[PDB]
PDB file of C-alpha atoms and ligand atoms in Angstrom:
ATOM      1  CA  UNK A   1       0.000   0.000   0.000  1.00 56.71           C
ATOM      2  CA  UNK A   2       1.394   3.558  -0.685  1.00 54.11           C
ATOM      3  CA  UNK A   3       0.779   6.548   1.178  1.00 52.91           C
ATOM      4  CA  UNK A   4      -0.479   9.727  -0.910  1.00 50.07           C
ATOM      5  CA  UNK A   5      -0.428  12.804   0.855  1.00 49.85           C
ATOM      6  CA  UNK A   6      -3.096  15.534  -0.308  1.00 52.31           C
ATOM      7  CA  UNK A   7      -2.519  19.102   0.109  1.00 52.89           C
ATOM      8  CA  UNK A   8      -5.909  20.653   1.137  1.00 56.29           C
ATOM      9  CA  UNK A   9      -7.056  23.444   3.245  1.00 57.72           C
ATOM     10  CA  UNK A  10      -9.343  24.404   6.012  1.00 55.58           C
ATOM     11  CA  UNK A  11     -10.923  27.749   5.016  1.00 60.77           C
ATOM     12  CA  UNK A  12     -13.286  27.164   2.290  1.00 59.48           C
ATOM     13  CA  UNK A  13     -16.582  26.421   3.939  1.00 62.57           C
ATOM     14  CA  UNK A  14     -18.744  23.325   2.584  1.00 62.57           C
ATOM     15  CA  UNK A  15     -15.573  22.237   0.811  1.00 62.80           C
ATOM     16  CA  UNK A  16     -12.320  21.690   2.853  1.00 63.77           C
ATOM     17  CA  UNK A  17     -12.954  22.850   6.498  1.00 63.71           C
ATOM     18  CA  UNK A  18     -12.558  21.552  10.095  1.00 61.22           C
ATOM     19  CA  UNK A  19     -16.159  20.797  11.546  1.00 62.19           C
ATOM     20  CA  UNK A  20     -17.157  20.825  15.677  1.00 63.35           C
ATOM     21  CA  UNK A  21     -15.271  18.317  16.174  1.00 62.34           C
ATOM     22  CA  UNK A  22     -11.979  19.365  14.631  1.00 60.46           C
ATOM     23  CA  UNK A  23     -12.458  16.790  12.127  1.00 63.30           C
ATOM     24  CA  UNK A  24     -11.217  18.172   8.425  1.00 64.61           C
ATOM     25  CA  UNK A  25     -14.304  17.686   5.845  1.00 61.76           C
ATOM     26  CA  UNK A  26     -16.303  19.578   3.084  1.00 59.88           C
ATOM     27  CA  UNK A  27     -16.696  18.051  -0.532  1.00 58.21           C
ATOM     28  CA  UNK A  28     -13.246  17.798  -1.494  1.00 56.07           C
ATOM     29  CA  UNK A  29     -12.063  16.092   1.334  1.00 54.75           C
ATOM     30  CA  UNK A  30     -15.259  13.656   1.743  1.00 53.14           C
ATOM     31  CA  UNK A  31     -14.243  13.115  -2.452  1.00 52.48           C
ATOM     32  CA  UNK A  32     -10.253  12.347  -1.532  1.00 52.30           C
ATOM     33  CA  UNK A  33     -12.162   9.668   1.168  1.00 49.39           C
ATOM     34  CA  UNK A  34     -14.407   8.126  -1.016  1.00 51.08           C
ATOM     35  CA  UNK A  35     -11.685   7.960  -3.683  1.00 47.98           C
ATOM     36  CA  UNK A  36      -9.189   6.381  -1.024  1.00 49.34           C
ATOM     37  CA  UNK A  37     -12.015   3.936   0.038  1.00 49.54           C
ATOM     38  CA  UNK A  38     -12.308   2.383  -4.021  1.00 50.29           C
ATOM     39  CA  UNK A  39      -8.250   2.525  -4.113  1.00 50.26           C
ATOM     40  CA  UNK A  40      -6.962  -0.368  -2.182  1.00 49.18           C
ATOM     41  CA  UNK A  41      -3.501   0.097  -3.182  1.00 47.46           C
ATOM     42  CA  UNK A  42      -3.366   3.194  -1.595  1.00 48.16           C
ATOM     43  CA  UNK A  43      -3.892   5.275   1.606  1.00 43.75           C
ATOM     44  CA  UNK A  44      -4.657   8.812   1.116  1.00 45.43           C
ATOM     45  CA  UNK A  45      -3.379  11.178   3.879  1.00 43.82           C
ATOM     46  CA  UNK A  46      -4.495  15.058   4.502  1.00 44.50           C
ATOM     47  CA  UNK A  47      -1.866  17.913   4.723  1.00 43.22           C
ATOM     48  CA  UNK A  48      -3.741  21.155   5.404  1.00 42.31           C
ATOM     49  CA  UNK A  49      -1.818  24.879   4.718  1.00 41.07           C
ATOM     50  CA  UNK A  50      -2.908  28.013   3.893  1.00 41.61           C
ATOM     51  CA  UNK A  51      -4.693  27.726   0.164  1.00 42.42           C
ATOM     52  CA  UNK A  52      -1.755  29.961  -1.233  1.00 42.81           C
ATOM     53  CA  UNK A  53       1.134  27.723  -0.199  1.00 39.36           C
ATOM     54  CA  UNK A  54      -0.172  24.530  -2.011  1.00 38.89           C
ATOM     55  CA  UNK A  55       1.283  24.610  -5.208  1.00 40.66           C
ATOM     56  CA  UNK A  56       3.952  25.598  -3.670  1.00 41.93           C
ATOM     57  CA  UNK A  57       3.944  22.357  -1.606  1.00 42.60           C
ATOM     58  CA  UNK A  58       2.965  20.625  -4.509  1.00 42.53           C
ATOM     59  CA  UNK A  59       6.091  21.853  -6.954  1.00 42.52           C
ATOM     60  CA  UNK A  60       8.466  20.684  -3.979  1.00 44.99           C
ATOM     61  CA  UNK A  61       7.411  17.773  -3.602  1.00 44.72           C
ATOM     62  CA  UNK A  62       6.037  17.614  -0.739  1.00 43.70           C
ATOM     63  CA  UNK A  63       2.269  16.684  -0.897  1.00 45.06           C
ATOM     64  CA  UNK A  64       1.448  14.246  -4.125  1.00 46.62           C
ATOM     65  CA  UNK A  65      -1.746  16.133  -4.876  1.00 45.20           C
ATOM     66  CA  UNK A  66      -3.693  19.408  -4.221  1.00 48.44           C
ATOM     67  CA  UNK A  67      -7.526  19.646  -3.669  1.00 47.11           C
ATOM     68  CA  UNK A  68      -8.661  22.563  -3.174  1.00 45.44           C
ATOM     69  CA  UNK A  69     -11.229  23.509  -5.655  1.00 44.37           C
ATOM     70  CA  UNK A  70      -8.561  24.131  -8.731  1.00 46.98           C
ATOM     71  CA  UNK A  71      -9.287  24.991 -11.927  1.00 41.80           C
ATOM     72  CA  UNK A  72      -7.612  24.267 -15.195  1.00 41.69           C
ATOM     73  CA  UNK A  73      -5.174  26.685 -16.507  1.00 38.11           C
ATOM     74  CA  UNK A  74      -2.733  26.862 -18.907  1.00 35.31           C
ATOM     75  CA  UNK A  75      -0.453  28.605 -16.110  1.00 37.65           C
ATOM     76  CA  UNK A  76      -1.223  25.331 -14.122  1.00 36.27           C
ATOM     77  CA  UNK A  77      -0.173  22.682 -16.774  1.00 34.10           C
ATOM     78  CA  UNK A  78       2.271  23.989 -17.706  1.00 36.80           C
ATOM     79  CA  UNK A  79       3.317  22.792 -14.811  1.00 38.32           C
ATOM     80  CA  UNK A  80       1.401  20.424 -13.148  1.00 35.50           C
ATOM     81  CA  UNK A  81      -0.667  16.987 -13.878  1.00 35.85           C
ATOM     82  CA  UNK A  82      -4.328  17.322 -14.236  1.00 34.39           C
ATOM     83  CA  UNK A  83      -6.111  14.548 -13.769  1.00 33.36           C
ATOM     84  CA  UNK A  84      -9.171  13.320 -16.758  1.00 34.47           C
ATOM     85  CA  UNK A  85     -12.235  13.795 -14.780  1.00 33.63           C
ATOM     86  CA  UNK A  86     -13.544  16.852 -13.356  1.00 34.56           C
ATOM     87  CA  UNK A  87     -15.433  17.542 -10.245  1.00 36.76           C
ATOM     88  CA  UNK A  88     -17.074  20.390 -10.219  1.00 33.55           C
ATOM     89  CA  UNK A  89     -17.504  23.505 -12.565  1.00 32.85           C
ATOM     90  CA  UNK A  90     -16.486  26.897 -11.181  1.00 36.42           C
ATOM     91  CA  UNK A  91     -17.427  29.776 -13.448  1.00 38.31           C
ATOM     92  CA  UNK A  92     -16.278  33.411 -12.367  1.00 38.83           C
ATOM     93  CA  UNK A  93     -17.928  35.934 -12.300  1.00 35.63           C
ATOM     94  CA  UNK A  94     -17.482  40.033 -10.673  1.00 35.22           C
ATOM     95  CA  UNK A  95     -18.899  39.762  -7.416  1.00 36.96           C
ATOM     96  CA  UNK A  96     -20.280  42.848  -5.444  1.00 34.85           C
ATOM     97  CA  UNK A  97     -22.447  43.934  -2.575  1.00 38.38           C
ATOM     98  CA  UNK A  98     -26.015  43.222  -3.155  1.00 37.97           C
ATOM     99  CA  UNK A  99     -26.692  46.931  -2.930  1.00 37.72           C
ATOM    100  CA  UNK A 100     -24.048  48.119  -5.703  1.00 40.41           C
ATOM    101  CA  UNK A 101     -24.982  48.481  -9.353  1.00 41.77           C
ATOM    102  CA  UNK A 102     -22.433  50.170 -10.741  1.00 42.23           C
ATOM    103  CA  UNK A 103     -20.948  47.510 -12.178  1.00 42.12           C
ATOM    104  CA  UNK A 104     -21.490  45.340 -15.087  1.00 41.23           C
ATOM    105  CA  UNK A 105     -18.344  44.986 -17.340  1.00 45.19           C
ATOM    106  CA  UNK A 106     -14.757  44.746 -16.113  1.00 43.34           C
ATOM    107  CA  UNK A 107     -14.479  48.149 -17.669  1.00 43.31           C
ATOM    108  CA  UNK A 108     -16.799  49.992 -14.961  1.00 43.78           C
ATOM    109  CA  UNK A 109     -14.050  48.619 -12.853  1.00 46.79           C
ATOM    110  CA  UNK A 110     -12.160  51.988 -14.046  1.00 49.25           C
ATOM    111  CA  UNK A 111     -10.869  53.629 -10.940  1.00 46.26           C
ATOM    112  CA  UNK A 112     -12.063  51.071  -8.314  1.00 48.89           C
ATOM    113  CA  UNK A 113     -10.474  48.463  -6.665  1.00 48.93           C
ATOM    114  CA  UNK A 114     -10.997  44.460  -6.047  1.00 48.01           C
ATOM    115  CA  UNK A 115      -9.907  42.349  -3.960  1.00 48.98           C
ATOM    116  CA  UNK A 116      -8.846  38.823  -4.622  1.00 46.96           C
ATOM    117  CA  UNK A 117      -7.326  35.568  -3.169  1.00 47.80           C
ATOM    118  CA  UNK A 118      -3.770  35.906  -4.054  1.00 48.25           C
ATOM    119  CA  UNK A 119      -2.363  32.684  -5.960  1.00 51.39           C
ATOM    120  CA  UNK A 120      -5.965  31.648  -7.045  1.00 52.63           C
ATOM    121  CA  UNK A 121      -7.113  31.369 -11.136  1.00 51.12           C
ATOM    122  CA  UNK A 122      -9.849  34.296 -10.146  1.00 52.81           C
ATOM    123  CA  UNK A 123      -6.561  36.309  -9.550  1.00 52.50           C
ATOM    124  CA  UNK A 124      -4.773  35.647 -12.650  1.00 52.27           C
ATOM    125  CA  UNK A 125      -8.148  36.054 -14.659  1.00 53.36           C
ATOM    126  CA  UNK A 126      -7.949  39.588 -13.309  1.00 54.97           C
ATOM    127  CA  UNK A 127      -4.470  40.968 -13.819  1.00 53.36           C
ATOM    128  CA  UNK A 128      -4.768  39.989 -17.202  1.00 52.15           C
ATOM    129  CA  UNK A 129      -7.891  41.861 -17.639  1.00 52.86           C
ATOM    130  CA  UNK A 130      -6.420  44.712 -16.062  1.00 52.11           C
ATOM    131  CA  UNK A 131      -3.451  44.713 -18.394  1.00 50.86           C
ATOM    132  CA  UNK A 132      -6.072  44.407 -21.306  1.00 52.44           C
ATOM    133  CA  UNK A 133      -7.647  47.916 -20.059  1.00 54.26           C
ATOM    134  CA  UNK A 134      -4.258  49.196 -19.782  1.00 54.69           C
ATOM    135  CA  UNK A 135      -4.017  49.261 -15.767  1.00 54.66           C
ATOM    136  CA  UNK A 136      -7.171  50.913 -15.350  1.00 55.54           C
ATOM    137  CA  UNK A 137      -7.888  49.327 -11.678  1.00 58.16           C
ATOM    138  CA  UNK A 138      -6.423  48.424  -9.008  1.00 58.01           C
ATOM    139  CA  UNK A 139      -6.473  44.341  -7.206  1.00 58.18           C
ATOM    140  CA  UNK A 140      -5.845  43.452  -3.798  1.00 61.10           C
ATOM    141  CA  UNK A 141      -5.179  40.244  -1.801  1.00 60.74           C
ATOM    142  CA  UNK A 142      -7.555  39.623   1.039  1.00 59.12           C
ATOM    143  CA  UNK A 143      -6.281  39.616   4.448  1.00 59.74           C
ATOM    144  CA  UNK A 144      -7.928  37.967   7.641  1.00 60.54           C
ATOM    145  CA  UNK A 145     -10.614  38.818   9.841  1.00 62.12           C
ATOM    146  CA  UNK A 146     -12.120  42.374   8.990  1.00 58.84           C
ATOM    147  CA  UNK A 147      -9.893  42.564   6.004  1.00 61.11           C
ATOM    148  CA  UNK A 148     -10.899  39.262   4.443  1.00 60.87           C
ATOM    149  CA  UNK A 149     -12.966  40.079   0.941  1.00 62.34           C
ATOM    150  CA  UNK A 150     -16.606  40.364   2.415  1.00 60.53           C
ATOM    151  CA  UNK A 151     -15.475  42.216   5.284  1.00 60.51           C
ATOM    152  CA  UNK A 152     -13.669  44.607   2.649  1.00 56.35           C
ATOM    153  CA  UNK A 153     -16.913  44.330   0.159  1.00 54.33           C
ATOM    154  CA  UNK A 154     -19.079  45.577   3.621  1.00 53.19           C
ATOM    155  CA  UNK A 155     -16.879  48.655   3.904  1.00 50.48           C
ATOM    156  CA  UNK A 156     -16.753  49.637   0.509  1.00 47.93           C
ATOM    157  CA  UNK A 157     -12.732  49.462   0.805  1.00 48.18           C
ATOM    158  CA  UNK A 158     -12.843  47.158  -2.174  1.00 47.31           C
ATOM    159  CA  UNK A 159     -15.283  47.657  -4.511  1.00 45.80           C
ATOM    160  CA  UNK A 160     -15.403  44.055  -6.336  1.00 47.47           C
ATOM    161  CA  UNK A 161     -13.806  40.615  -5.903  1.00 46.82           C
ATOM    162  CA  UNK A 162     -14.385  37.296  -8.271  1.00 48.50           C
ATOM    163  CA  UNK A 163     -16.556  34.329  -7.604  1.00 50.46           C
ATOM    164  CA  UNK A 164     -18.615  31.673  -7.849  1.00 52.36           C
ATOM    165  CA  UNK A 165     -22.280  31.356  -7.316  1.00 51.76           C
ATOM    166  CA  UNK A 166     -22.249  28.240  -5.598  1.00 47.58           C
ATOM    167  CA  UNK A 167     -20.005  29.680  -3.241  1.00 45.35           C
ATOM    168  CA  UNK A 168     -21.835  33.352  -3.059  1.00 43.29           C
ATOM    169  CA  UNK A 169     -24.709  31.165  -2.188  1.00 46.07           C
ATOM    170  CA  UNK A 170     -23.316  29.591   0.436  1.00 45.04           C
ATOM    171  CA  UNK A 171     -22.038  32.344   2.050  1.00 43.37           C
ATOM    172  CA  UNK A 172     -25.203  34.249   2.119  1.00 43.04           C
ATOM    173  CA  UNK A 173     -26.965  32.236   3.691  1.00 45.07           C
ATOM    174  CA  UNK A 174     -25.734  33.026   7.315  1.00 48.18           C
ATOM    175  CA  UNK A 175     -23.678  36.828   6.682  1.00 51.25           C
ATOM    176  CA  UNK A 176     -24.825  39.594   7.010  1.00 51.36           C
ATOM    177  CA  UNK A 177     -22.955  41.118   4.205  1.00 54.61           C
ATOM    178  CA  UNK A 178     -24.669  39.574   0.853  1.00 52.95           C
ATOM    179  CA  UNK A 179     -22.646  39.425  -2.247  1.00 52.73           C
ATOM    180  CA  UNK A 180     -24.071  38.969  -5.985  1.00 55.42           C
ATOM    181  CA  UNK A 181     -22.482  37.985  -8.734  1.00 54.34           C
ATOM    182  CA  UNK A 182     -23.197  40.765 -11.994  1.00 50.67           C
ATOM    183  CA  UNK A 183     -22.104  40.405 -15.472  1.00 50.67           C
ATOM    184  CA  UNK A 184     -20.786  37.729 -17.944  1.00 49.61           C
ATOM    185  CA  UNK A 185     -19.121  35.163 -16.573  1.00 49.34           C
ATOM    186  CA  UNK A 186     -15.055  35.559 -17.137  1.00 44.91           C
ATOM    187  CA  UNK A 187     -13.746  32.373 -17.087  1.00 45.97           C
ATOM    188  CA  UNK A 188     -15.440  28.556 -16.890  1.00 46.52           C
ATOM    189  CA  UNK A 189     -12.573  26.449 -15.920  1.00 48.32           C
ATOM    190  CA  UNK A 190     -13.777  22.872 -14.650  1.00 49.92           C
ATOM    191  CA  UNK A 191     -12.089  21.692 -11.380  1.00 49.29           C
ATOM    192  CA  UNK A 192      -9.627  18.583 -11.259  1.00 51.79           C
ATOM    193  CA  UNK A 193      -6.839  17.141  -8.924  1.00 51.03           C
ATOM    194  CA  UNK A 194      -3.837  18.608  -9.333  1.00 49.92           C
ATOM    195  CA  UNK A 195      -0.416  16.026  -9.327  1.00 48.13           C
ATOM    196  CA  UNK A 196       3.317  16.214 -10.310  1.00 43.49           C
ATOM    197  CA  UNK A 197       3.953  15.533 -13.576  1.00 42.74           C
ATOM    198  CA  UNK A 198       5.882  12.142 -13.038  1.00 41.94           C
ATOM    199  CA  UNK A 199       2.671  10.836 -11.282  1.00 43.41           C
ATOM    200  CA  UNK A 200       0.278   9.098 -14.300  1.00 41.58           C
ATOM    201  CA  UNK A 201       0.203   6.829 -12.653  1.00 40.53           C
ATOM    202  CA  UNK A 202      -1.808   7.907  -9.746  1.00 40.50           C
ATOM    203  CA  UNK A 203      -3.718  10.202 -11.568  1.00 40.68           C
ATOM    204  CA  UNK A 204      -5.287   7.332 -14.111  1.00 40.79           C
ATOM    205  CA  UNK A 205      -5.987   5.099 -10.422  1.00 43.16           C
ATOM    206  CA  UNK A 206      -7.816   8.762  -9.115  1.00 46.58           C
ATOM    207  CA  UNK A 207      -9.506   8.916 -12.580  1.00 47.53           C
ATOM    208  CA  UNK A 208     -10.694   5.183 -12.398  1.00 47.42           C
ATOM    209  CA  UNK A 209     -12.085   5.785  -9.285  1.00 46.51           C
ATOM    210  CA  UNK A 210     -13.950   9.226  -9.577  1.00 46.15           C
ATOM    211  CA  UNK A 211     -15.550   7.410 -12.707  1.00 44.38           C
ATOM    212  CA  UNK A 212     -17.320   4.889 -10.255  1.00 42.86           C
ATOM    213  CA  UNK A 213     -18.497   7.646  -7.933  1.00 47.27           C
ATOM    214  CA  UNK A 214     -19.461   9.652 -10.975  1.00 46.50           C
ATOM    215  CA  UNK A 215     -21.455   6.024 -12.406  1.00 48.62           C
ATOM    216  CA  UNK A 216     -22.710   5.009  -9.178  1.00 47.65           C
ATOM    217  CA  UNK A 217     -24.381   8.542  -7.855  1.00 47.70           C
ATOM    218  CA  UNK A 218     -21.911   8.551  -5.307  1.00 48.97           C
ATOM    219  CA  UNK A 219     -21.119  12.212  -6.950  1.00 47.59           C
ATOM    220  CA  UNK A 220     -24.568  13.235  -7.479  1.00 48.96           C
ATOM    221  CA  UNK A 221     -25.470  12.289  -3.987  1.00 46.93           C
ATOM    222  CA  UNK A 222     -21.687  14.365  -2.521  1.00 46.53           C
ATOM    223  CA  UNK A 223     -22.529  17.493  -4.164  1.00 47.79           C
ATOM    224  CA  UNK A 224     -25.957  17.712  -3.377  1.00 45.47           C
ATOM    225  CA  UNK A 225     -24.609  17.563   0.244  1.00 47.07           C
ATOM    226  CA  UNK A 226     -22.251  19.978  -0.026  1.00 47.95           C
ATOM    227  CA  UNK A 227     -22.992  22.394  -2.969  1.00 47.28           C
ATOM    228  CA  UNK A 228     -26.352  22.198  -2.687  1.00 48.45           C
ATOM    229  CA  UNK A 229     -29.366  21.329  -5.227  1.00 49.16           C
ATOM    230  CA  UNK A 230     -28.766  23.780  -7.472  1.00 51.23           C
ATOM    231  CA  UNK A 231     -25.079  23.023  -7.901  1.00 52.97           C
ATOM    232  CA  UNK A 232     -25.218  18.936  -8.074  1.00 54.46           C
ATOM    233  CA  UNK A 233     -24.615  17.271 -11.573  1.00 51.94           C
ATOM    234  CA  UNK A 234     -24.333  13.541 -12.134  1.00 50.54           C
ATOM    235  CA  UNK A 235     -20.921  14.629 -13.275  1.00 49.31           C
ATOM    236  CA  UNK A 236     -18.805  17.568 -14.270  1.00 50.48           C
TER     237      UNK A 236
HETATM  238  N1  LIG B   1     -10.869  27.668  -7.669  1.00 51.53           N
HETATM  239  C1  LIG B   1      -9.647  28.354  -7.148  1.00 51.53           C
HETATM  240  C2  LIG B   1      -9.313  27.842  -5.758  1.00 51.53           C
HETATM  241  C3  LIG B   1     -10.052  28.580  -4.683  1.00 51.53           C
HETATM  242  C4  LIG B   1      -9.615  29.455  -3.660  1.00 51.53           C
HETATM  243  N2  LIG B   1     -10.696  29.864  -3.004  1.00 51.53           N
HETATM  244  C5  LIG B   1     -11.788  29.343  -3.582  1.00 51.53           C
HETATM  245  N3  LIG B   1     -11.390  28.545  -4.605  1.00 51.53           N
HETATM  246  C6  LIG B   1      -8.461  28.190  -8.038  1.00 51.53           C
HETATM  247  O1  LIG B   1      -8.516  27.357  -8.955  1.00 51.53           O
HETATM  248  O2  LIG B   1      -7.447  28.902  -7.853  1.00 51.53           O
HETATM  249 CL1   CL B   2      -5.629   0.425  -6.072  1.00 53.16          CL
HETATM  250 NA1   NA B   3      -7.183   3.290  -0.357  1.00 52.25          NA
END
């Protein structure tokens, strides 16, 4: 049996998270079970770290996978292994307070500023829009506590950050600062596992097995639980 040690974290609610109990859970890390459980050659193992140190981990060596949500890039394969099969879909879109509508269109961005996740694809999908309009705003990285992104949305200090409605959804439902999304959705990456390069291996035994939660309902049945109705597929 080998060990595989997956590089997750603990502050994305409904997806990798530590519950009452302390016990680490959310969709992606219920997934990484259910995929260890239909693997018997292997034993899956958590390593949690802050979101923006994973691929960092990952491109020393020193988790064998990342799940965390991660989209398909370019940027990212060049890189890294994707796996076949994705998981989830997680379009972006310009996300504001539920009061604002002043803005549509990245370019009515012009003089504001947005605050972002640093090291995420919602990040990248934003500088490059922002060299596009010739540096016409300005993006920030979300701290903690009153300077995470809603807490910066609430104040007005930022004026935008990037998201996805299943997780605008989920957030709403117990804040008192409610986001929207507005406008056209900016990119519609699909999320897979992320590996090393050298490991095919593992990533066709991760890909045999998501296909039989995918074929059994097991996936259906996972995001349902933890994206909620109006986010659950059969498959990705
Ligand atoms: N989907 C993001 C990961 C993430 C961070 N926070 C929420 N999601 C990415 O691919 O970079
Ligand atoms: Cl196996
Ligand atoms: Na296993």
């Amino acid at each position: 049996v080998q060990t595989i040690t997956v590089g997750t974290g603990t502050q994305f609610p409904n997806v990798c998270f530590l519950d009452e109990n302390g016990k680490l859970t959310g969709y992606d890390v219920e997934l990484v079970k259910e995929i260890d459980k239909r693997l018997p050659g292997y034993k899956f193992k958590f390593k949690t770290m802050d979101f923006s140190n994973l691929l960092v981990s990952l491109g020393a060596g020193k988790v064998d996978i990342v799940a965390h949500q991660m989209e398909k890039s370019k940027e990212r394969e060049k890189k890294f292994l994707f796996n076949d099969v994705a998981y989830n879909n997680f379009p972006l879109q310009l996300t504001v307070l539920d009061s604002n509508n002043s803005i549509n269109s990245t370019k009515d961005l012009a003089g504001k500023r947005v605050i972002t996740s640093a090291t995420s694809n919602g990040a990248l999908v934003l500088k490059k829009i922002n060299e596009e309009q010739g540096n016409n705003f300005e993006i920030a990285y979300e701290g903690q506590g009153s300077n995470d992104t809603a807490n910066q949305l609430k104040t007005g200090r930022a004026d935008a950050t990037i998201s996805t409605p299943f997780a605008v959804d989920f957030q709403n439902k117990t804040s008192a600062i409610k986001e929207k999304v507005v406008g056209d959705v900016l990119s519609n990456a699909k999320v897979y596992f992320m590996l090393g390069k050298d490991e095919t291996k593992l990533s066709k035994k991760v890909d045999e097995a998501l296909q039989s939660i995918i074929d059994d309902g097991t996936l259906k049945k996972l995001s349902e639980k933890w994206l909620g109705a109006d986010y659950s597929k059969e498959q990705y």
